[model samples]
Target: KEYSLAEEHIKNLPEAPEGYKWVVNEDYTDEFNGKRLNAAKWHAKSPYWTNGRPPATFKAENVSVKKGCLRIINTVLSPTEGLDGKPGDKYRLAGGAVASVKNQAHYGYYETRMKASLTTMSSTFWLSNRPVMKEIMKGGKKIKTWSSQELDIIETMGIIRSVNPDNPWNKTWNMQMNSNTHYWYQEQGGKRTDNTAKRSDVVSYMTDPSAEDFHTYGCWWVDANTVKFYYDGKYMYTIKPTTKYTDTPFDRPMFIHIVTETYDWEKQVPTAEDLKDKDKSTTYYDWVRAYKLVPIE
Candidate 1:
């Protein structure tokens, strides 16, 4: 895949190291140097329902592609109000995300180089299947059940245990490096698989993953049942499907999502005091790339 800005922006990139080639049919490599996002490749914000999980409202204004990187900021829309417009109710924390709506990959090795915001938001690079599951016949009608498969390559939302050692949840999640797979399905709620949901399997690193410094995050979809994860190119964790887990959600094409998200229910939500002017809660992505294992021809 020849990116017109390859020589100018992508001096080096998130890619498969060797013995493989990129799946270039919309294989993306972006250093957000331009003023606007490449609409053909990325949706500045996810059109699908993304509620206050990253506790803020989803707004395109919060997302900017510039300065050789994609910047997603989580800032207070006003001193006391967020984008949701309710006074004293931060129903929305304004943030940004870029997703591949025009493109999708079945299996690949994907990576992103990024820096994270020190605030309460989860800075993430992940993959998710399309928003609908198989249509089912119910009440003498065909209905689309809520369904999805998400491969969370990186989610930087850990609370440092040392901050409060007595609180076990905080300690357990302190400065944690994480990855997991979610297969969501239910009649209409779109809940994740019972046994496979929210399993924080391995603590990838014991320190703050971003620490205001840049790092690389990677994931290899090895097969239908196995997924290997990496941090700064080092092996971290592997996610596998359970025997009881349905594979359809993952077996289909999936797209990339890079986000800075927050939820109201987080252990610690970002507050005015928590986010200082200098700190300016934001996540930056230098570049992202994807590749399939070269076929043995």
Candidate 2:
């Protein structure tokens, strides 16, 4: 059965608690009506314009707004087109991504209700800083340490519809979602340091992980020092930046990014047979919003 227990949560999203009040801080929110996306608030592709995954190109045709929701699809090329910019001799994949402008929000809430792809691929909703690092000054010199980071509210990577709960690594069978944060600064010469939630730590789901049903994924950037991840309407886990990696913390504003991409990892990959029909594989977003927390009067 399609579980919409979470839909009720979004419809009646709680106001900021006794210690806080939620303020409107949305740079943009979309219900995705009208057969198109709002250009003023979103872009079809991120500023980078290229996906880092195997099928790198972001085709305009791969994205659409219809049926009162946003749909992003990955179609299997007919083996004539190369995969992800490869020579057109082999089969490859193409998908979709959308990102908000550099409208950053720190110390607030970012959330979206989305249905994960049924086929094997990653459906992601997350936040990112502008792809640049700020220089740090220490001891009267511009320190080599620079700052940059990314936060993932939800990453349903390689959802395995097959049920084999005892599988150690592929906990998608167990209804798990991942939360992650990465810190890397090439300009500052710092190596990447990643903080991630364990699959075992995932908040339990009321429905199957690969079900087409929509679920809410959220991130509460509580302050400069902490971030709490949420599934449906409940807490999952929290993260804090390690000062050794960045002088600036999660306090900096970040933009929203959502994408559906295909690649083989952890032994999970989609095959040509998986995308034979229009209904085979796709990701859908019902809505996305942001809210700021203010202290109660």
Candidate 3:
């Protein structure tokens, strides 16, 4: 069998490498063209973890479709009104995310064209498997275990205003493309463990920072053991499972997540004054596309 992408907007997308043909995976593709998100294809909030990183909660109201783009708006919320309209100091900020309803496994190419939010919050495109639990006999007793995998194709902090001298983020980080892969597992009575592989590169290939303009970020899950990252159609780096983890740690199927959230380590969150500027606090996603490689005849 053979397949091809039917979307006109993606006609100029890169072709599959030699000996392979690109087959569009419609389940994970979106142009964000209409006035509202396609509910059949996406969930307004992340299903894996409904509440976003502490101090920042995921709010459906923050996700919207307008001006031909999907927007995730970040806001500094009032301390008295927190997540789920509850009173708590932890819900100081609100962000948004859209997750794919379908899960995909094995080798494929995933890409998104987006403009990072001009705030300290992270603008990200990633894939992760929902944690699964299973029971098995261990020490002559039934024990439960949970496991999952993640692939962070791109995670960028658009604005770095931290004054801390020890902060790792600097001006260069604003224009950098960061990627990471992780395998997480835990036993019923054991602490969770995360095995990670990380790679990053400054987007020096482009003249503008990620927040200033739209750029394409993509990753090719070449196989269970290797993944390649790209920015603006240019290859950046590759990551493979570290020696400490199993070679096929990425074997699980995963779903997509396009989100923006506050990071604890960032040491800086968008101020009330900053969030007021809608233009700066909103991450704009122009489109997302997924493709699978089919052997050439």
Candidate 4:
């Protein structure tokens, strides 16, 4: 059954009255004899290399299927190598699943029951504007051009896919560096390349609470131009309208997605010395969901 979301839809949603359908993919199914839907259906959209390309055949395996929860782990060694570094690949452990069903939810609510990491490097969860990724991937015939419009959902320091951010004595002083809930949406290589200018972001007090328990981390795609994100239903940060620049179809049709990126911290911002460390540290996502508005009476 789909989630009843009239209570949250400020405007409209497609999957609401349309009576949504489902498509299963063997590539991203469950683990451990298949009892749960931890990995569900997710695909990768990584552009780590200068001219990188998203894998056409990616999958997830050996997932934690016991705790009655979906756990996407990012440790030194994974028992199952689904999306292993390609032969002679420079990237390290970039294993995870992309949406196998090609097209999925355009809008509504996306909530994941999981925890966050507390280390500057461990703070790992992010969201890529799905509708945009789908279009670009379809158009370009691949997904390397995903610089369309991506968002770092909410990364924690001490949390694991199965646990929450570590909080000792609950003392909090988190520096949300380059915290994006503030980046201007645009393309890296478009006709109006200059149209997408870089901008500054907001500085908010963030905390890494103990993540041994489940907490709802979420985001609301209210049209392409607006996206509201939250931690445990609390507005952790937001990506709303900004008087910056350019021409975009951000308000048009769009899709929703949640994924765990590998070595995103070092990839996004890394020092040569830090890069020297052995390849083992990375991030992963448990589950991705969608919600839509009910039809008007």
Assess the local accuracy of residue 72 in candidate 1 as a C-alpha lDDT between 0 and 100: 81
Top candidate on TM-score is 3
Query: Which run of 10 residues does model 3 get worst, by summed lDDT?
Result: 1-10
Candidate 1 residue-wise lDDT, 82-139, digit = tens: 4444566655356676777654676767777888787767788888766575677768
In candidate 4, stretches whose alpha carbon ends up further than 4 angstroms from where it belongs are: 1-34, 38-59, 62-64, 77-86, 89-104, 117-126, 129-147, 159-205, 210-212, 241-249, 252-257, 262-288
Residue by residue across 91-185, what tens digits does model 4's lDDT show? 33323333333333445555555554322234334444432333345564643332244444555443222222563322232223222443333
Better candidate by TM-score, 2 or 3: 3
Q: What would the C-alpha RMSD of candidate 1 be, to one decimal place? A: 4.6
Give each model a TM-score.
0.77, 0.78, 0.87, 0.51
lDDT of 2 by residue, 155-207 (tens): 77435644445755654432665667776455455564454323323445333
Sorted on TM-score, best first, the list reads 3, 2, 1, 4
**Model 4 quality (TM-score):** 0.51
Runs of candidate 1 with Cα error greater than 4 angstroms are 1-25, 79-92, 135-146, 158-167, 170-174, 188-208, 247-249, 264-267, 276-279
lDDT of each: 0.65, 0.65, 0.79, 0.38
Clashes of 3: 0
Tell me, by lDDT, which candidate is best: 3
Candidate 4: 10-residue stretch with minimal lDDT? 49-58
- At residue 252, give the lDDT of candidate 2: 68
